[PDB]
Design a protein around this ligand. Structure first.
Ligand SMILES: Cc1cc2nc3c(=O)[nH]c(=O)nc-3n(C[C@H](O)[C@H](O)[C@H](O)COP(=O)(O)OP(=O)(O)OC[C@H]3O[C@@H](n4cnc5c(N)ncnc54)[C@H](O)[C@@H]3O)c2cc1C
Ligand SMILES: Cc1cc2nc3c(=O)[nH]c(=O)nc-3n(C[C@H](O)[C@H](O)[C@H](O)COP(=O)(O)OP(=O)(O)OC[C@H]3O[C@@H](n4cnc5c(N)ncnc54)[C@H](O)[C@@H]3O)c2cc1C
Ligand SMILES: CC(=O)N1CCC(NC2CC2)CC1
Ligand SMILES: CC(=O)N1CCC(NC2CC2)CC1
Ligand SMILES: CC(=O)N1CCC(NC2CC2)CC1
Ligand SMILES: CC(=O)N1CCC(NC2CC2)CC1
Lengths: 588, 588
């Protein structure tokens, strides 16, 4: 079945040239298309295994078997002589631009996955439009091009994390001989926000420049898919029009949820608001226990804030719960307060936010615990981090026929196709996929190569590593301990673990046995590493490289025969030997 | 095959029990040995592929074929009934202690490898002595148990590096909103030295406690091997004596070299003296260009010093030379001066060191460039970092028969055996091996297991990752680019590379295109990764995990299908695409 690959490739591509590396008649067609500023995909057949059979099947469209052969939007155009005839007759530009729709591709959503898909497709001659719009938050916050990660997620989160880490660096520097006095140093919230927002502005602008230089049309517009090939767009002044595209990629992401309780929307905020907030939050309550809740609470305390987290049930639901508890214990020991097994009932306003003097307001939070006892306390800022959800009713007409699941996410095949054959979805709205920025980028780039350059590589969504940037960071790749035990049984699981202490913490007089790591392994499969977990500084840097080994099937013997780099935190993975079944302590 | 292994295992093990997991009489013997504090190896025949063959071969030694069987130093002792008889009759202790020699093992040298070998051997019942001595430096410097890395190597070097890193952390903190003024903060050298030396002292003590708790005899003595089984030991008071051992492990390491020029030994120092120097070096000249030279020049400059490095020919000979040059370019941009193609001719004393007032002296350094021009300049401190060498003529009487190579290192088989069948060598003095602390530890532990516990695993010295802790760190694993081209030819080698900027450097306004990473791959072996190189922060944490993947045979495709962790520096390895042959720019 090489024939049905070739048919799908020729059908879907915009401009594609079948070529060979040594053929100089091919080279003359290349240099002609380059000078004409015509972009295209190229399939070198001497570099593919079965390029012989493909050459034969090209005759089914073109009635010739030689190379080069040029196609445009499913139609054969000519061999060398015919393409040069079109060029010197000035007929070539009209032929490549002839299309049944306005665009080969329309991307709805200009974030991590959408921008990456659109730029990749434009590399192969696909005429591309990228639509993006930011619906404002209840208090009116808005931002520029690039999506959740760039503006209100990974980028400003980690910069603010770094600002918190530097407070411990100032304390540490005294013990290492520097003459500063940490107790006499304080933090300016608005200076930090100005620097963070200035970096984000350079990224908004770089993405506009990127799209321009790839000949991608950027429309700042709210998109709505009304039929398989029609997208209705609405302007900043409410002007409405319609554009048409061959392929459609949905990549509109999610926004934060609010609890259905009085006062929440009126008087609370979310992470959408926190990263450009013009005043220090002050005494803050963070409601929820996701990674967003814990990351935000953690740097606020490190910047000297008075911080409480209200937890309905457990921390980091879905992550390894031994690890989650070590994360929260570290936080509790370094100034974050927890109200456990608790839930909010209402937010009362006591003092309006003072815009002129750059001051928070004042709120009264009422709630109750699972036993029945009551919660009541005042806070200057209340931040909700109780999940995120898509809003596809605003994007999709029911009549088009794109199937959603019961959470509102799009049901896709393993190549991102929806139930409507020309419509695909990527990123956080793809049901069941990990909701991470590098996943959405890989999904979008690989999809664009399949649609417009005849690629076959799929995205692999298994064993994707994560890092939670709490004050002590937590990296992971693979199964939690409890998920492995439940899948294979407790007698088939072996766990190797150890505490450790970074060398940097010795002269600084930090704790001896808080950093921690383990390997969860399958006995009956040669001690296969099923999950890796580490709590310590620089956990993202530590974890990333092991994700390649786990993808490759690493076993415990693979970790053992590798030698460590000394002195590092990471090298402790190369000499693990204490098992949980042995009952031997893991302390250093 | 099996029979030669069994003969080897029985002959050299001190106390060993042959057993099966489900064998109630074996359990009877284990309990008696545990109750009598008799340490021993154990081989569970049911856990071995060919335990059936082994069980039959045991009769060639004991004339029985059941388990348990207990041996001591090559002699069958009995089954369960016979062992209990010796126990009940108060005869067991003297049986398990009977030996032709004072010790089952004598380790000459108490550093990284030797301490690890000694402790591991004692775990299996081997009666063990560890000998350690520290020959003072020319000005009298000395230190405690633990070797080069612990006292005058990796540990104090990386602590001082960390002190240097904190100066940039103090600068960065302003930009992230903290109120300090970096320009009014200074560094106190003796305060840092006191904290470093306190940590080292806790490690000196920890090793003495560990050897005690493992029943290893520690002798603070200079050792000399005068025949295959006799070690002469000389006292702190010059008392001489002789001990005997069955097996000998040489683990005496190396010391710094001095160039043969007037004034070098009298008025200069080495790294052996630097890590406990009671005064700040002041204006300093580092002579040499190894990683020791550049790491020391590096943190001295970050701590406010006026620093010059005098380079005979190139930086970091034997490392990838493109990366070496980026390392040195970064140092030159951040204050380190270089005198290139230059060599020293003599050191003259202008001032004597002032021990009382705690101040360096003053020196005049004279030398010449390779074209004949003259070098002449004054310095307060001159550090020689021009290599290290063993001193085995002090350890190894000629008549013993242990063969050395032309550099004076010990020629060993792949199981660390020397030319004398009961004598082994590990660590820096094993010719041709990487000279690193984790390698010496792996070699010593693995060897002890083969000698006293029947193990067969050998140490793997290939593709061992390294990290150079210059102000911008350089991590690596596998071949340099020039080595790969030399070995396979330029047309079979593809290099993927990219610049990157750490997110933490954005708000701090640090350099855009200084950090750098590349993968060196072999086209004809499925784009196998031959070498990985990265220059940036936390380079050792970044690199370690990739070393497991390389050990496993990772290819470029394995790096592409792995998803990144965002935002990290390390994730840049998972999306590399610009090749050096393309000529496309690697900047961002
Ligand atoms: C606080 C926080 C921290 C995070 N930290 C990390 C982290 O450290 N690492 C990590 O890997 N991930 C992190 N994430 C997750 C990451 O941000 C997302 O997985 C990623 O942004 C998803 O990208 P996307 O392309 O699917 O959608 P998005 O990046 O959300 O972009 C979709 C865009 O489409 C727009 N849009 C919506 N509807 C329409 C419409 N009708 N018309 C036009 N445009 C529309 C949206 O306004 C938005 O601009 C974090 C998320 C949050 C909230
Ligand atoms: C400045 C510096 C920095 C380094 N940094 C790193 C780093 O970051 N990472 C890394 O992996 N490696 C590093 N190394 C290398 C590391 O220190 C060595 O590879 C390691 O210490 C060698 O271990 P060893 O057991 O072979 O010998 P050693 O650790 O040198 O121990 C040998 C011991 O035997 C003693 N001895 C000698 N002769 C006798 C005798 N006749 N009788 C009794 N005792 C004797 C010696 O005095 C010494 O105590 C560094 C080295 C230096 C010099
Ligand atoms: C609704 C509609 O007609 N559009 C909305 C997006 C706008 N983009 C401006 C031209 C750069 C204009 C087009
Ligand atoms: C609620 C609200 O103010 N918005 C809806 C209409 C939007 N028009 C998009 C920007 C082209 C602007 C945002
Ligand atoms: C006989 C000799 O010269 N030795 C010197 C070193 C001594 N150390 C142990 C604690 C006494 C051991 C004896
Ligand atoms: C065996 C031992 O501990 N010694 C102490 C110091 C050694 N060298 C100093 C320079 C004279 C000599 C012997």
């Amino acid at each position: 079945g090489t024939s049905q690959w070739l048919r799908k490739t020729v059908d879907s591509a915009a401009v594609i040239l079948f070529s060979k590396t040594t053929c100089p008649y091919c080279k003359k067609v290349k240099d002609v298309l380059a000078e004409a500023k015509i972009k295209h995909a190229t399939i070198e057949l001497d570099q593919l295994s079965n390029g012989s059979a493909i050459q034969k099947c090209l005759a089914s469209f073109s009635k010739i078997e030689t190379v080069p052969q040029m196609f445009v939007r499913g139609k054969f155009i000519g061999d060398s002589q015919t393409v040069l005839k079109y060029y010197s007759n000035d007929e070539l530009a009209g032929i490549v631009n002839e299309s049944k729709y306005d665009y080969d591709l329309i991307v709805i959503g200009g974030g991590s996955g959408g921008l990456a898909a659109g730029k990749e497709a434009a590399k192969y001659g696909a005429k591309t439009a990228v639509l993006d719009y930011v619906e404002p938050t209840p208090i009116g916050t808005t931002w520029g091009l690039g999506g959740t990660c760039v503006n209100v997620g990974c980028i400003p989160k980690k910069l603010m994390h770094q600002a918190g880490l530097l407070s411990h660096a100032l304390e540490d520097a005294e013990h290492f001989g520097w003459s500063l006095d940490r107790s006499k140093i304080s933090h300016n919230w608005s200076t930090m926000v100005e620097g963070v927002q200035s970096h984000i502005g350079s990224l908004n602008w770089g993405y506009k420049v990127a799209l321009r230089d790839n000949q991608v049309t950027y429309l700042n517009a709210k998109g709505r898919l009304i039929s398989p090939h029609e997208v209705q767009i609405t302007d900043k002044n409410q002007k409405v029009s319609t554009i048409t595209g061959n392929k459609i990629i949905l990549a509109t992401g999610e926004r934060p949820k609010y609890p259905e309780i009085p006062g929440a929307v009126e008087y609370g905020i979310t992470s959408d608001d926190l990263f450009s907030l013009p005043y220090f939050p002050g005494k803050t309550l963070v409601i929820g226990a996701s990674y967003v809740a814990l990351e935000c609470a953690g740097f606020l305390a490190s910047l000297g804030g008075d911080v409480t987290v209200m937890v309905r049930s457990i921390l980091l639901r879905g992550f390894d719960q031994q690890m989650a508890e070590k994360v929260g214990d570290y936080m509790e020991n370094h100034g974050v307060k927890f109200a456990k097994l608790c839930v909010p009932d209402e937010i009362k306003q006591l003092k309006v936010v003072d815009t002129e003097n750059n001051k928070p307001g004042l709120l009264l939070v009422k709630g109750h615990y699972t036993d029945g006892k009551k919660f009541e306390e005042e806070f200057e800022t209340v931040i909700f981090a109780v999940g995120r959800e898509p809003q596809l009713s605003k994007v999709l007409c029911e009549t088009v026929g794109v199937k959603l699941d019961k959470n509102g996410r799009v049901v896709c095949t393993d190549d991102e196709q929806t139930t409507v054959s020309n419509v695909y979805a990527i990123g956080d709205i793809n049901a069941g996929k990990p909701q991470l920025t590098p996943v959405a980028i890989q999904a979008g780039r690989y999809l664009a190569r399949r649609l417009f350059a005849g690629a076959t590589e799929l995205t692999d969504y298994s064993n994707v590593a994560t890092t939670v940037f709490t004050p002590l960071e937590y990296g992971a790749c693979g199964l939690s301990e409890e998920d492995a035990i439940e899948k294979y049984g407790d007698k088939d699981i072996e766990v190797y673990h150890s505490n450790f202490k970074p060398l940097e913490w010795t002269v600084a007089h930090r704790e001896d046995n808080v950093c921690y790591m383990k390997l969860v392994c399958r006995k009956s499969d040669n001690m296969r590493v099923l999950g890796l977990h580490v709590l310590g500084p620089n956990a993202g840097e530590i974890t990333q490289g092991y994700a390649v080994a786990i993808k490759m099937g690493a076993t415990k013997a693979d970790f053992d025969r590798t030698i460590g780099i000394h002195p590092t935190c990471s090298e402790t993975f190369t000499t693990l030997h204490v098992t949980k079944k042995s009952g031997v302590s893991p302390i250093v």
